[PDB]
Design a protein around this ligand. Structure first.
Ligand SMILES: O=c1ccn([C@@H]2O[C@H](COP(=O)(O)OP(=O)(O)O)[C@@H](O)[C@H]2O)c(=O)[nH]1
Ligand SMILES: O=c1ccn([C@@H]2O[C@H](COP(=O)(O)OP(=O)(O)O)[C@@H](O)[C@H]2O)c(=O)[nH]1
Ligand SMILES: [Cl-]
Lengths: 232, 232
């Protein structure tokens, strides 16, 4: 416990996991970002507190981070992120949405932070299979389980720094919030295969979220989501 | 005064028949030899023609899918209630086919001749198909329309005092095989998004596992869609 850890996440599941990690480890603080929406969780404005953070902490561990860390922070203290995609494929926003569409792997990756988003030396990663009946929702739920097991399994090694991280072979691709937003509008005139349309719908089905929509002939907006059930 | 035989295998029509029995009273309610209503007696119409003609003044069927023997038609006045808008998508599950082809759907009360859902129309009422409708949601409305249309015209149907008009054209007829064919989704089929979306909503009826495909690993997967219009 000579290792003093700062945990940063705006994600509700990662936060719950951070709380368990706290019970287990002890010398550990949990914050969210200035724009995070977790109720009752204090906020570190990382961009301003670089000095405090470096002096005060031995390791900064973030979950699902979307902003880049300032170079000075990356230098002054060991920074690690947990991303719920399989780097370097579909880095950035909502990896399993884009993976359902393009067929690239999804999973959870624990990695050292550099100046680019979801980039740089990989500590560990597990792939998550995408079944033909999976929606974004069902995959995401599995990813959160994988994340919990992966992080818990490797916590000691992350804490102690007893790993050798390996950079991915290639740069992969990056998706941003705009990219998800563009997927949401369904163009009723677009041509494609049924499989293509079906993937589109399931990639945009996540429990109750009203993601996919079209505007009908009379100007009414209609929300679409899909239900896929494999036989017993 | 007028003794009615009601024939239906449909659960909603049966309930409606039970109410009509409470009103008119000189009326028996049966199902067919292959119907599945719990505890409802069965007329094997094909073999009881002489008895039916003798015993009854009107045979009123709901959602009939088998053709009446010519002997019965000539021997007693036969009227059918069909949950389609004759002559369009006569036969099986009209709104399923109507959602896909854009023809009108509704409820038609008509005289029975030698062909299925054919012969002089007594009364009919159209049901609008909204862009967010599924087969399930249309069908619920069809069952309400059927109730209202039948209660409105009951005395006249009972009386025999209506005018009836033959439809101008033959229309089209859909059979169980046709519905069965629709169910199989071909993931390589090309079309517009709107087309595919109509196909899925057409095959969505509450919990029915209608639409299906077989994935690469040989696993059968059922598909339904959930459409929700914004608050008007
Ligand atoms: O408007 C949204 C926001 C999120 N999600 C889904 O919910 C998951 C959780 O995203 P969240 O914003 O909770 O945080 P992240 O997973 O990016 O940390 C995402 O992967 C999306 O699949 C969605 O369907 N619509
Ligand atoms: O295997 C089935 C059977 C019925 N239905 C739906 O349920 C409605 C009523 O079916 P029913 O068997 O009661 O036939 P009906 O008496 O209306 O001809 C149909 O129009 C279909 O929309 C379905 O989707 N799949
Ligand atoms: Cl490795």
């Amino acid at each position: 416990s000579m290792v003093t850890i700062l945990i940063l996440t705006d994600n509700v599941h990662a936060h719950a996991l951070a709380v368990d990690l706290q019970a287990r480890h002890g010398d550990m603080d949990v914050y969210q970002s200035p724009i995070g929406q977790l109720p009752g969780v204090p906020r570190c404005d990382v961009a301003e507190r670089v000095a405090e953070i470096v002096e005060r902490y031995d390791l900064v561990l973030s979950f699902h981070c979307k902003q880049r860390f300032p170079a000075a922070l990356i230098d002054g203290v060991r920074c690690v992120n947990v991303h719920p995609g399989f780097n370097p494929y579909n880095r950035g926003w909502f990896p399993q949405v884009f993976s359902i569409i393009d067929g690239q792997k999804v999973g959870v990756t624990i990695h050292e932070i550099d100046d680019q988003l979801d980039h740089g030396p990989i500590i560990a990663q597990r792939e998550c299979a995408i079944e033909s009946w999976d929606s974004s929702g069902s995959v995401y739920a599995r990813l959160m389980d994988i994340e919990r097991e992966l992080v818990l399994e490797h916590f000691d090694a992350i804490r102690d720094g007893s790993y050798t991280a390996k950079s991915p072979a290639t740069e992969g691709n990056l998706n941003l919030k705009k990219d998800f937003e563009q997927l949401r509008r369904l163009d009723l005139n677009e041509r494609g295969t049924f499989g293509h349309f079906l993937n589109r719908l399931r990639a945009l089905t996540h429990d109750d979220f009203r993601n996919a929509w079209f505007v009908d002939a009379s100007g009414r907006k209609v929300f679409v989501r899909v239900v896929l059930e494999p036989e017993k």
